[PDB]
Amino acid sequence: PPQREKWSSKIDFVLSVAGGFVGLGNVWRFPYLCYKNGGGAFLIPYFIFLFGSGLPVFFLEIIIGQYTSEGGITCWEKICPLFSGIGYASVVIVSLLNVYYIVILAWATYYLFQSFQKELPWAHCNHSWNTPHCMEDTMRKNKSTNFTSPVIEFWERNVLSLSPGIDHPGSLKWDLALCLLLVWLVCFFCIWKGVRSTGKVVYFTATFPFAMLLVLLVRGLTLPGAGAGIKFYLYPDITRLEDPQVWIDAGTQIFFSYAICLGAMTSLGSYNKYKYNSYRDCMLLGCLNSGTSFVSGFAIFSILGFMAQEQGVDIADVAESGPGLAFIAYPKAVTMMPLPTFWSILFFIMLLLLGLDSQFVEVEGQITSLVDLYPSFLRKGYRREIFIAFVCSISYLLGLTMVTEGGMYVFQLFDYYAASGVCLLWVAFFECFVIAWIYGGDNLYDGIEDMIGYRPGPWMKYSWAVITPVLCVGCFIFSLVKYVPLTYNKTYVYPNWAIGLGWSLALSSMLCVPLVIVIRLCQTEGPFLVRVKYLLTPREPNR
Template sequence: MRAEVEERGHWGSKVEFLLAVAGNVVGLGNVWRFPYLCYKNGGDDCVDFSIKNASVPWTNQTNSTSAATEFWERRVLAISGGIEEIGSIRWEVMLCAIAMWITCYFCIWKGVKSTGKVVYFTATFPYVMLLILLIRGLTLPGALQGVKFYLLPEPSRLTDPQVWMEAGSQIFFSYSVGVGCLTVLGSYNKYNNNCYKDCLWLCLLNSGTSIVAGFAVFSVLGFMAHEQGVPIAEVAESGPGLAFIAYPQAVAMMPLPQLWSICFFVMVILLGLDTQFVSMEAVMTSVIDMFPDVMRRTGRREMFLLFFCLICFFCQLVMITEGGMYVFQMMDYYACNGGCILFLCVFETLALGWIFGAERLYGIIKDMTGVNASPFFKICWLYFTPLVSLGSFIYSLVEYQPLTFNRWYVYPDWVYVLGWLLALSSVLLVPGCALYKLITGTGTLRQRFHHLCQPDIENLPTQKQEGNNSLLPADVKEQNDHLILNS
């Protein structure tokens, strides 16, 4: 007997949706990237844009290098001399990776039914840890100096285009713009969900978390600089260095360092876990929606998710070797580059504003929420957002700098070629797919192009699909009929 196609499903409650989005947008970048960018680019100018042991292991120093640096780079990662020296797999790190993938699997294996329950813990507990670290950090000597360096504005930096580029990239990454996660999570809402209110509160939550995390981080770094008698610039780092070197080294100087270390790393783990399984859900939902008759059957989702996790894990193995950090930095710099997201956002905004139609989108939002969107949104959809995205993308190409590791290691030329191929592998999928559809379509070239520029109106979600009688407003239906007749 053939298995029945399962329903797509909805969130169990509005709280589950909000926590899932919060868990996705509030991630590691809020803790280790945003505070450093604020300090680097002139304080709040960047904000305007948007177990008991005798000691913790990274305090036992055996050479002139920082103890935390030695522990992280030599004991945990055992970093080799270069990407050519890939070395052996670090089994401790591999076991951690296995544990995380197993956790992610069971977090989303039943779709939003399981994800919606997990986020009650994974999305809220980091805030408890952050609050504890904030209170502790602000009570340390030298904390005020750290906060001062974090917030001290430098108005002259506003004339530097690089500041605006970094602020814009942080906004794209922090809010998960253009990568599909928010679209997927929102697709499990009821038709009449108030997206306005959701956007407002989640944006405030994300930005507020970044600012508060900056206070928590730089108050501790200020204490570290105070204890060592050095400027805070010498202890402030960005990226993984802030989370795994600078902050742990500062924590080691506090009373009860084990307690504060546990709080910090539990927070980091949960922030990363949330972002990872929500990103996985975006991929799963996309594939299942493309092949619903095949994938929405009993056991199919679980089997495909297992296959997906295994593929990701085996691809990850090269990054948990002795030379894996070099590979990780290359992937982060090229494959996860902000320019790639900007390029995709250009196509997304053009498709939304010009092909799907700003007027049609405007009418659908009114039908869903019961209120008219601001006319300014139309200007953004049609002109402002695609032009800003395109301009930022071009600027990122003009200002491109080859990747280096820790400011001293220069990658071989073949790595740069591989990096650009990784970047192109993501950005060329959109125009490549369009070209494929254009070539394989029927009719003349003009007819095929015209057909590809028409939205699939018949499959738009409506209130009627959820038991109500009203469909799209009359003006939108009239516009749809007009477009169909003209096509």
């Protein structure tokens, strides 16, 4: 391990970060979490968390990676050897996230392959998967039995084929399994070979999604009924703020969308030069991420308002209110533009491009963090390609559980418990507490001043010292005191063993800190206080 290879230029670092932390979490997860919580009231805790913990923790991870010049699992050895379980917890969280983050891309691939016909299959109600209820959206207001929309019927009876419950796995769907295999093969081939920053390819891969988003926003804003959707999206409801669910959802959506507590930002920052101003760039990238999410919300809620006006029902009873809101709302939008197939193909290509870069960055970060533990064995003595192939195969086999007829429930369980929620709060709280109260805020500020050239303000120091731990602990305690079980589409109730499995998924990463603390204490010689003093001393964080 001579030295980590630095970036060729700052543009490479900026492009890598932008492609890694802007993606499906901005256009797929934000809208449905906002819709589930009623909209409007979701934006107050969202912005509170964004300006209290979101940017400061992201900058802290980047600056720690740059300072220590080490990955996301070994940097904590040079800051606080006792609290070295944070890296292991992050690697567990990223391993669990990589398994279920790709089923969305499998669904997108299915939709893209299905959009190559003369007429879109989700536009009408005369097919083998339709039910006697299916009625055209144009005729819903004209007449009147619980009618169903062709888009929802398609999504629920052709792509998913939903089962009565999680205890009814049904049979494996081979068409979705083939799409999952295809996307996993593409991901594996784009990592073993190592996709380079081709000037033309990236120039297009990083500009097409924003153009498509602008086109969708312009189309949505001119539909009849967009004003009601915008008012539903913007105006808040103070009564909803008395529940911990909205607070925890909005708080952890920021953590999910900024890719923190994952070990990926530390790895990305480890390739920076020592004398590099990585503060302004981080602020601008956070601005870009938040703006992208906020802009996409306008378009999706305008489409929802138009659909609600057309069908003649409320805006809260038009879509899934779960991980299918985008797949219900955006195809309905593209069915109204001229040449619907062209725009459908373009939209799904944009979705795939947004997802694939994030998946690439996360898997690369996980691999490079797990390799640094044994840099001798897994570099020459054993093949790195074989290790990558084994990881991909195991992840695909594990993700096969969400492809069966009853896999939506497993996907929802994974989304709620793994790589989101209490585990993210736990990791963020421990990172901030360690840095602020064991290493030293001013001690880190000296290194930041040495690296970037100027001393920052007290905002980051205060956020690390007080604001973030208080928010995390308060949200955790508020959620625990008033407990409400998880549901799917506000109607399905999970069995007890499913909740136990979800809590085990959450605890698999949360249990890594005390175990590592105990093992480190047991591996040291001498009196207890001497051992504690020896393991709280930073082992020369390279300055």
